[PDB]
C-alpha cells in the first residue's frame, strides 16, 4: 500500500517438459503467482505457478511451450493470482480463452480486478432456487424443470444436437410467474463459455446470438480446439468470475452455458500427466471431483443481493456412457441431469431428450400452485410411470409378439407412440407455454381410463379429467 | 401496404441512426471534458505513487 | 517457529518442525490457516491445510499448537451450523457484514459472552465427583435441556460449586481438588476429534427406531443406536428419509453432518428446517432447530475438510449420548469422503489398492461406524444414551462391487438399498425389498412380541409372498399368466396390493406423512389375513370349480373389500389410534365375513 | 417480410454495437492520453538533481534489499551516471545497516539509451540470472495497472 516493488525477472529455465517450464534458483516464489514469459523472439506468453518447492518452482504456460530456451527465456513473477478485469461494458463482447478481447475493440477498462475462484459463499447466506424459468422445450418444462440458480448439465454424446438445444434454451429462456414475465434486469445476460469447440460450433453460436437480437446482452469467451489446451482450464473460471460480478455485484439474472466439460477433463488429464501425479479412474487426476465442485458450486441465488446465477454446463460422454469419471462426478455434484439419447436421434426427433433418465432435484420447489397449475407434479409423475411401464410392456411384446399383448398393453404402446411423437417433439424455433404443455400432457394422459391413473389424485382428476 | 411499411421502417432506421450518432457525440464530449478536468490530478497521483520508496 | 518449504495443492511441507507430532494442528502463513500434520520425513512435516493454499510463500512462518484436531463443546451447540473445522457460520455472517467466508477467519466455535442459566444438581461442598458426573443442568432452549458433565479425564473433591443463576462460559462453575492439587472447570469442554468419548460399557439395543416411513419401520427395521446405510439417492433417500429421521423419529435429537453435497440442496435444507414445526413433544409445536445441528461442508469446500466434518459430527453425537439423549446422526457424506481419501492418499504419494482407493479405507470406515451403539454412560447418576449412524453410499448406478459399498456392507447392520428402477417408476420410498436386509430382526423379538404377538408370522408371510411373486415374475416373462393357477393368481394379486398400498408412501400428504407402527401393523395383518383366507377358499374347491373361478368370484362379487383394503392407506393418523384401530378391526371383521359368505353358497 | 424486418432489427443492433464500441474506443483513447501525459511527467521528473539523488538511493536500497544477493552488478544510464557513482557506497552502508550482513560487492560498463532508461536503475545479480528492473518506466505501467480501477471510478463524468 505504501510503496511498490517492480516484479523480478529471471532466466533460470532449467527444465521444459510439455506444458511445464521448471524454473530454478528462484526466491520468494508465490503459489499460483501469475508469471510473464518473454522469449528470445520477444513474444510474451503468460503462465501460472502450479507448484513451489524450495528454490524451485514449476510453471505451466497457457500459450504453450514452443520456443523456450534455457538461456534467453525470461520469466517475471507478477506476485499475484489471476485477476480478470470486469466492467459493465463486458456485456456484448466476444473474448479469447484467457480474456483478451477478440472483437477488434479495445481492452476492458476495469471497474475492479476480482481474483479467480472467487470468495466462498457461506451456506448460511444462500437461498434455495425459488422461481422457475420457462425453458421453452416441453419435455423440460413438464418434467425436470429448471429453477433460477439451478445447475442442469445436459448429458450428450458425439453427434447429438446438444449445441442446437443449448442455443434454443438461450433464445427461449424466460420467467414464468403467473405468465406475467422491459425486464432489463430480468434479461438473463447470458455468458457463454466454449472450450474445445469445432470452429463450426463457435460460428453457429455467434450467428445465433447475433440473429436473436441479443448481441448487446450475451458475452462469449471462446477456447477453440486449435487454441492452446491449457487455456481451457482457465476459460470456465473466467466465465464464472464474470458471471459472479455481473450478477451479485450488479443485480442481473445471469445464465451460463459451459460447453464440452469433457474438453475440460481432458485439460485436467494433460496437466496431471505432465506432473507425474498418481492417477485416478481411467487415469484422470484424483482431484477431478474437487475441480468439478469448484467449477459448479459457483451458481445460485444469494440472500443479500437481487442477482442470481443459473448455469447449464453441457457434457459429452466419451463412448456414450455414464460410468465415465467426468459425467459420473458431474451427476454427483450437479442438481440435475438431462439425457439426450442416441435412440431418439436414430428415430429422427429433433429434441432427443430421453425423459426417463432425466432428473431435477429442485423440481419440487420450482413448481407449485403459486406459480404453476396444481396438477403439475401429478401430471409429471403419471406420464413418467406410464412411459416407464409402457416401455417394459413394449420390451415384453418384442418377444411375446404383438398378439400376446393385452388391452392395457395396447393402451401403453399407443401412449408411448403418441408421447414420443406428439409430445417430446417440438419445433426448432417454436416454444410451448407451460399451460399449453400441461394441456398436451393431459391429452396424452386421458388415453387411459380414470382407474389406471393411480398417481393422479381424484381432486385434480375432477378439475382436469374432462376439461 | 408492404411498400409503405418498408418506407416507414427505413425512415425509423435513419432516425435511430441519427439519434445514436448524436448520443455518441454527446458521450464523447462528456468523456473528453471529464478527462481534461481530472488529468492533472490523475497524473499527480500517479507520479506520487511512482516517486516514493519505503526502506 | 517453522517455515514453509513446498506448496503443492493442499499438501504443504514445512521444514524446521523437528518435534512436531502427528496430527498436531499447526497454523500456516500470515493469514493463519488451520492445518493438520499428515506425514514426517525428519526436520520437515507434511501438513493438510483445510483451506485454499493459493498465495503461500517460501519461508512463510508456520506456528505449532501441540493440540490435535479438537472441537469445542458446551451449551449452545444445538441449533447451529458449523463448518468442517467447526466455525459458527451464522456468527461469521453477522460479525463480518461480508456475505462471503473470508480466508483464515478466527472465530470461537461457541460464543463466549452469551448469558446462560445455571441449575446445579444438588452438589455439596466437600463432596466427591468423577468423570462424566452430571452436576448441573442448563436449559439451552425449551423442550431440550442440556446437562453439564465433568470431562471423562477429570476427578476430585468438590471444594467450590457455583450457585444457581446466570453464567457465561468464561466463568468457573465448578472447582475440584485431587491428588493434592486443584483444578477448575468452565462450561466449555474441548475434546480431540478422534479418540471416541469413553463409555462405561456398551449395550445390546432393544428399542426399534420406529421411523415415520412404513417400509423402514416394518420390513427392514433399525434399532436405536443401530447402524444403517442408504445409497444417498435424491428425490427419495437423502430428502424423504432425512425428513423422516429428523422431524418424525423417536430420536431425542438430530445431527445432520451431510458434507460433500450440492450447495443448492444444503441451502434448501438450511432454509426449510428453520420452520419445521414437528410435534416432537406430546402437545407442543416447537421447531426442530431447537433439536438439530448441521455440520454442513459443501462440495466446493477444501478436500481435506471432509474427514474433519465426519469426525466432528460423530464427536457431537457422543457428547449428547453421554448426557442421555438418543441422538441419531445422518451423514449424506461417505460418498465424497472416499473421494477425499483418494485425493489425499494420491497427493501424499501413497500406493493405491483395489480400484485405486487407499488400502486402509475399511479401517477408517470401521473406526467411524463402530462409534455407534447404545452405551451405559460415565459418572453419576446411572444413565443410558445411544448414537445412530444412517450414512450414505454411492447412488444406485454402481453395483455393490464398489469398494466403499463393500466396506460399508461388511460393517453396516441394516441396508436400506434403494433401487433406481423403483425411482424410474416414481415409487417414492424406493426401497428394494429383495436386496435390503436388517440383521437386527432377532434383537427386536421382545418388542415385536410385546406389541403384537402375531406380527412376526404375518411379516414372514409377507416376505414369502413378495419372494414368490419376484420368483415367478421370470416365468411370467416367458410364458405369461395363462398357466397361472389359483394360488399363483391370488399371490400376485396380494403382492400387487402390498406393493401399491403398503410399500408406497407419498409423505407429502397427511395420509402418508407419518405412519405410526400400529397403523402399519394393522395394514399388514389385514392384507395377510385376506391372502390366507383367499388361499383357503380357493383350496376348498366348493361348487365343483373353486380355484381361479373362486378367485374371480372374490375379485368381482367381493371386490368392495378389496377396494377398501387398497384404500386403507388413507386412514388419517390425526383421527387417533382408538378410531383407526376400530376402523381396521371393522374392516378385518368384514373380510372375515367374506370367504365365508362366499363359501356359503359353495361359490 | 418477417425476415426483412428481422434483418432490419439485426442491422439496428449492429449499429448500436458499433456506436457503443466507438464510445468504448474513445474511452480507451483518453486512457492512452492519460498514460502519455504521465510518461511525460515522469520524464520531466528527471530534471531534478538533489531529490533525484535521494530517490535513486532509495531505489537502489529497495532493489538490493529485495535481491538479498552477495554480489549484484548495477547498471545505470550514461546520463546521471555521475549521480550513481556519487551515491556509491551509501547504498551499501544502508543495506549493511538493514541487517547484519557484509556489504555487497556492487559493480557498475554498458548503459541503455536515455529514453529507454528515463531514470531508475537495473541491479540484477552475477551472470545476470536474476534481474530487478527498477526503471522509472518500469515503476510506471505497474502503478498505472494497479490504479486503473481508481481511474475509472474517477471518470464518473
Swiss-Prot record, chain C:
Keywords in alphabetical order: ATP-binding, Hydrogen ion transport, Ion transport, Nucleotide-binding, Translocase, Transport
Function: Catalytic subunit of the peripheral V1 complex of vacuolar ATPase. V-ATPase vacuolar ATPase is responsible for acidifying a variety of intracellular compartments in eukaryotic cells.
EC number: 7.1.2.2
Family label: Belongs to the ATPase alpha/beta chains family.
The protein's name: V-type proton ATPase catalytic subunit A
Annotated binding of ATP, by residue: 232-239
Reaction catalysed by this enzyme: ATP + H2O + 4 H(+)(in) = ADP + phosphate + 5 H(+)(out)
TM ranges: none
Oligomeric form and interacting partners: V-ATPase is a heteromultimeric enzyme composed of a peripheral catalytic V1 complex (main components: subunits A, B, C, D, E, and F) attached to an integral membrane V0 proton pore complex (main component: the proteolipid protein).
Gene3D superfamilies: 2.40.30.20, 2.40.50.100, Bovine Mitochondrial F1-atpase, Atp Synthase Beta Chain, Chain D, domain 3 (1.10.1140.10), P-loop containing nucleotide triphosphate hydrolases (3.40.50.300)
Top-level EC class as recorded in UniProt: translocase
Gene Ontology biological process terms in this record: ATP metabolic process
Matches recorded under InterPro entries: ATP-synt_VA_C, ATP-synth_a_Xtn, ATP_synth_asu-like_sf, ATPase_a/bsu_AS, ATPase_F1/V1/A1_a/bsu_N, ATPase_F1/V1/A1_a/bsu_N_sf, ATPase_F1/V1/A1_a/bsu_nucl-bd, ATPase_F1/V1_b/a_C
Top-level taxon of origin: Eukaryota
Gene Ontology cellular-component terms listed: plant-type vacuole; proton-transporting V-type ATPase, V1 domain
GO-annotated molecular function: ATP binding; ATP hydrolysis activity; proton-transporting ATPase activity, rotational mechanism
Endpoints of the signal sequence: none
Curated annotation (Swiss-Prot), chain D:
Disulphide bonds in the chain: none
GO cellular component, one term: proton-transporting two-sector ATPase complex, catalytic domain
GO MF annotation, one: proton-transporting ATPase activity, rotational mechanism
rRNA-binding among keywords: no
Assigned keywords, A-Z: Hydrogen ion transport, Ion transport, Transport
Function comment: Subunit of the peripheral V1 complex of vacuolar ATPase essential for assembly or catalytic function. V-ATPase is responsible for acidifying a variety of intracellular compartments in eukaryotic cells.
Quaternary structure, from the entry: V-ATPase is a heteromultimeric enzyme composed of a peripheral catalytic V1 complex (components A to H) attached to an integral membrane V0 proton pore complex (components: a, c, c', c'' and d).
Family named by the database record: Belongs to the V-ATPase E subunit family.
Protein name per UniProt: V-type proton ATPase subunit E
High-level lineage: Eukaryota, Viridiplantae, Streptophyta, Embryophyta, Tracheophyta
Whole-protein residues included: 59 to 226 of 230
Amino acid at each position: 500500500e505504501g510503496t511498490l516493488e517492480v516484479a523480478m525477472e529471471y532466466r533460470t529455465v532449467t527444465g521444459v517438459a510439455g506444458p511445464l517450464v521448471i524454473l530454478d534458483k528462484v526466491k520468494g516464489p508465490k503459489y499460483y503467482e501469475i508469471v510473464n514469459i518473454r522469449l528470445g523472439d520477444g513474444t510474451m506468453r503468460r503462465g501460472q505457478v502450479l507448484e513451489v518447492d524450495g528454490e524451485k518452482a514449476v510453471v505451466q504456460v497457457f500459450e504453450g511451450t514452443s520456443g523456450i530456451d534455457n538461456k534467453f527465456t525470461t520469466v517475471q513473477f507478477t506476485g499475484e493470482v489471476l485477476k480478470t478485469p470486469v466492467s459493465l461494458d463486458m456485456l456484448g463482447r466476444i473474448f479469447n480463452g484467457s480474456g483478451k478481447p477478440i472483437d477488434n475493440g479495445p481492452p476492458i477498462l476495469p471497474e475492479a480486478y476480482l481474483d479467480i475462484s472467487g470468495s466462498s459463499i457461506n451456506p448460511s447466506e444462500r437461498t434455495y432456487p425459488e422461481e422457475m424459468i420457462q425453458t421453452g422445450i416441453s419435455t423440460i418444462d413438464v418434467m425436470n424443470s429448471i429453477a433460477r440458480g439451478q445447475k442442469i448439465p445436459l448429458f450428450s454424446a458425439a453427434g447429438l444436437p446438444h449445441n442446437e438445444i443449448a442455443a434454443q434454451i438461450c433464445r427461449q429462456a424466460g420467467l414464468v410467474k403467473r405468465l406475467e414475465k422491459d425486464g432489463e434486469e430480468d434479461n438473463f445476460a447470458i455468458v457463454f463459455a466454449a472450450m474445445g469447440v469445432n470452429m463450426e460450433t463457435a460460428q453457429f453460436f455467434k450467428r445465433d446470438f447475433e440473429e436473436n437480437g441479443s448481441m448487446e446482452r450475451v458475452t462469449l469467451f471462446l477456447n477453440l480446439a486449435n487454441d492452446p489446451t491449457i487455456e481451457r482450464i482457465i476459460t470456465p473460471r473466467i466465465a464464472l468470475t464474470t458471471a459472479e460480478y455481473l450478477a451479485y455485484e450488479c443485480g442481473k439474472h445471469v445464465l451460463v452455458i459451459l460447453t464440452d466439460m469433457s474438453s475440460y477433463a481432458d485439460a485436467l488429464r494433460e496437466v496431471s500427466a505432465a506432473r507425474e501425479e498418481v492417477p485416478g479412474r481411467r487415469g484422470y487426476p484424483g482431484y477431478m471431483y474437487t475441480d468439478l465442485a469448484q467449477i459448479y458450486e459457483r451458481a445460485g441465488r444469494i440472500e443479500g443481493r437481487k442477482g442470481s446465477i443459473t448455469q447449464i454446463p453441457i457434457l459429452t460422454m466419451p463412448n456414450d456412457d455414464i460410468t465415465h469419471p467426468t459425467p459420473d462426478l458431474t451427476g454427483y455434484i450437479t442438481e440435475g441431469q438431462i439425457y439426450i439419447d442416441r435412440q431418439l436421434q436414430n428415430r429422427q426427433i429433433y429434441p432427443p431428450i430421453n425423459v426417463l433418465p432425466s432428473l431435477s432435484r429442485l423440481m419440487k420447489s420450482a413448481i407449485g400452485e403459486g406459480m404453476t397449475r396444481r396438477d403439475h407434479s401429478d401430471v409429471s409423475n403419471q406420464l413418467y410411470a406410464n412411459y416407464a411401464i409402457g416401455k417394459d410392456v413394449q420390451a415384453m411384446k418384442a418377444v411375446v409378439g404383438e398378439e400376446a399383448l393385452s388391452s392395457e398393453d395396447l393402451l401403453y404402446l399407443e401412449f408411448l407412440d403418441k408421447f414420443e411423437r406428439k409430445f417430446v417433439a417440438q419445433g426448432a424455433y417454436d416454444s410451448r407455454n407451460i399451460f399449453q404443455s400441461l394441456d398436451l400432457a393431459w391429452t396424452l394422459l386421458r388415453i387411459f381410463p380414470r382407474e389406471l391413473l393411480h398417481r393422479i389424485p381424484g381432486k385434480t382428476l375432477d378439475q382436469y379429467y374432462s376439461r | 401496404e408492404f411498400q409503405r411499411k418498408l418506407a416507414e421502417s427505413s425512415g425509423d432506421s435513419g432516425a435511430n441512426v441519427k439519434r445514436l450518432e448524436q448520443e455518441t457525440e454527446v458521450k464523447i464530449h462528456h468523456l473528453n471534458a471529464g478527462a481534461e478536468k481530472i488529468q492533472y490530478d490523475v497524473v499527480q497521483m500517479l507520479l506520487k505513487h511512482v516517486t516514493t520508496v519505503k526502506n | 517457529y517453522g517455515y514453509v518449504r513446498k506448496v503443492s495443492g493442499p499438501v504443504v511441507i514445512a521444514d524446521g518442525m523437528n518435534g512436531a507430532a502427528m496430527y498436531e494442528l499447526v497454523r500456516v502463513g500470515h493469514d493463519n490457516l488451520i492445518g493438520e500434520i499428515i506425514r514426517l520425513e525428519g526436520d520437515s512435516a507434511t501438513i493438510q491445510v483445510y483451506e485454499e493454499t493459493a498465495g503461500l510463500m517460501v519461508n512463510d512462518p508456520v506456528l505449532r499448537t501441540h493440540k490435535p484436531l479438537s472441537v469445542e463443546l458446551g451449551p449452545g451447540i444445538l441449533g447451529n451450523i458449523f463448518d468442517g473445522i467447526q466455525r459458527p457460520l451464522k456468527t461469521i455472517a453477522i460479525r463480518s457484514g461480508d456475505v462471503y467466508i473470508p480466508r483464515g477467519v478466527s472465530v470461537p466455535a461457541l460464543d463466549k459472552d452469551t448469558l446462560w442459566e445455571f441449575q446445579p444438581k444438588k452438589i455439596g461442598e466437600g463432596d466427591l465427583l468423577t468423570g462424566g458426573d452430571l452436576y448441573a443442568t442448563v436449559f439451552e432452549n425449551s423442550l431440550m435441556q442440556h446437562h453439564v458433565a465433568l470431562p471423562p479425564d477429570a476427578m476430585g473433591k468438590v471444594t467450590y460449586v457455583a450457585p444457581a443463576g446466570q453464567y457465561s462460559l468464561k466463568d468457573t462453575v465448578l472447582e475440584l481438588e485431587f491428588q493434592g492439587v486443584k483444578k477448575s472447570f468452565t462450561m466449555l469442554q474441548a475434546w480431540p476429534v478422534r479418540t471416541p468419548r469413553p463409555v462405561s460399557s456398551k449395550l445390546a439395543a432393544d428399542t426399534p427406531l420406529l421411523t415415520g416411513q412404513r417400509v423402514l419401520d416394518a420390513l427392514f427395521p433399525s434399532v436405536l443406536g443401530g447402524t444403517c446405510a442408504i445409497p444417498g439417492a435424491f428425490g427419495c433417500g437423502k430428502t424423504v428419509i432425512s425428513q423422516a429421521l429428523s422431524k418424525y423419529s423417536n430420536s431425542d435429537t438430530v445431527v445432520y453432518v451431510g458434507c460433500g453435497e450440492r450447495g443448492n440442496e444444503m441451502a434448501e435444507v438450511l432454509m426449510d428446517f428453520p420452520q419445521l414445526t414437528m410435534t416432537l413433544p406430546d402437545g407442543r409445536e416447537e421447531s426442530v432447530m431447537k433439536r438439530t445441528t448441521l455440520v454442513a461442508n459443501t462440495s466446493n469446500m477444501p478436500v481435506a475438510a471432509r474427514e474433519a466434518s465426519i469426525y466432528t459430527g460423530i464427536t457431537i453425537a457422543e457428547y449428547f449420548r453421554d448426557m442421555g439423549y438418543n441422538v441419531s446422526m445422518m451423514a449424506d457424506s461417505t460418498s465424497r469422503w472416499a473421494e477425499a481419501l483418494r485425493e489425499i492418499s494420491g497427493r501424499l504419494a501413497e500406493m493405491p489398492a483395489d480400484s485405486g482407493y487407499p488400502a486402509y479405507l475399511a479401517a477408517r470406515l470401521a473406526s467411524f461406524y463402530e462409534r455407534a451403539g447404545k452405551v451405559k454412560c460415565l459418572g453419576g447418576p446411572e444413565r443410558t444414551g445411544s448414537v445412530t449412524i444412517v450414512g450414505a453410499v454411492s447412488p444406485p448406478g454402481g453395483d455393490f462391487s464398489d469398494p466403499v459399498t463393500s466396506a460399508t456392507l461388511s460393517i453396516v447392520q441394516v441396508f436400506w438399498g434403494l433401487d433406481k428402477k423403483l425411482a424410474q417408476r416414481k415409487h417414492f420410498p424406493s426401497v428394494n425389498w429383495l436386496i435390503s436386509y436388517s440383521k437386527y430382526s432377532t434383537a427386536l423379538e421382545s418388542f415385536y412380541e410385546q406389541f403384537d404377538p402375531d406380527f412376526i408370522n404375518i411379516r414372514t408371510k409377507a416376505r414369502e409372498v413378495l419372494q414368490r411373486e419376484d420368483d415367478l415374475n421370470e416365468i411370467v416373462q416367458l410364458v405369461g399368466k395363462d398357466a397361472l393357477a389359483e394360488g399363483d393368481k391370488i399371490t400376485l394379486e396380494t403382492a400387487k396390493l402390498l406393493r401399491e398400498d403398503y410399500l408406497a408412501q407419498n409423505a407429502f400428504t397427511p395420509y402418508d406423512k407419518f405412519c405410526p407402527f400400529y397403523k402399519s401393523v394393522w395394514m399388514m395383518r389385514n392384507i395377510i389375513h385376506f391372502y390366507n383366507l383367499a388361499n383357503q377358499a380357493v383350496e376348498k374347491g366348493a361348487g365343483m370349480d373353486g380355484q381361479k373361478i373362486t378367485y374371480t368370484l372374490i375379485k368381482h362379487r367381493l371386490g368392495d373389500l378389496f377396494y377398501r383394503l387398497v384404500s386403507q392407506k388413507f386412514e388419517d393418523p390425526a383421527e387417533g389410534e382408538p378410531a383407526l384401530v376400530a376402523k381396521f378391526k371393522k374392516l378385518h371383521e368384514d373380510l372375515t365375513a367374506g370367504f365365508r359368505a362366499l363359501e356359503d353358497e359353495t361359490r | 417480410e418477417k425476415q426483412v424486418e428481422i434483418r432490419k432489427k439485426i442491422e439496428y443492433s449492429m449499429q448500436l454495437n458499433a456506436s457503443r464500441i466507438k464510445v468504448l474506443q474513445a474511452q480507451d483513447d483518453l486512457v492512452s492520453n492519460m498514460m502519455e501525459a504521465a510518461s511525460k511527467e515522469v520524464l520531466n521528473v528527471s530534471r531534478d538533481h538533489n531529490s533525484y539523488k535521494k530517490l535513486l538511493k532509495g531505489l537502489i536500497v529497495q532493489s538490493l534489499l529485495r535481491l538479498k544477493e552477495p554480489a549484484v552488478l548495477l547498471r545505470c544510464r550514461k546520463d546521471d551516471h555521475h549521480l550513481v557513482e556519487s551515491v556509491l557506497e551509501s547504498a551499501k552502508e544502508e543495506y549493511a545497516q538493514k541487517l547484519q550482513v557484509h556489504p555487497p560487492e556492487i559493480i557498475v560498463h554498458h548503459n541503455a539509451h536515455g529514453p529507454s532508461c528515463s531514470g531508475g536503475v537495473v541491479v540484477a545479480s552475477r551472470d545476470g540470472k536474476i534481474v530487478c528492473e527498477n526503471t522509472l518506466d518500469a515503476r510506471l505501467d505497474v502503478v498505472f495497472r494497479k490504479k486503473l480501477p481508481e481511474i475509472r471510478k474517477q471518470l464518473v463524468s
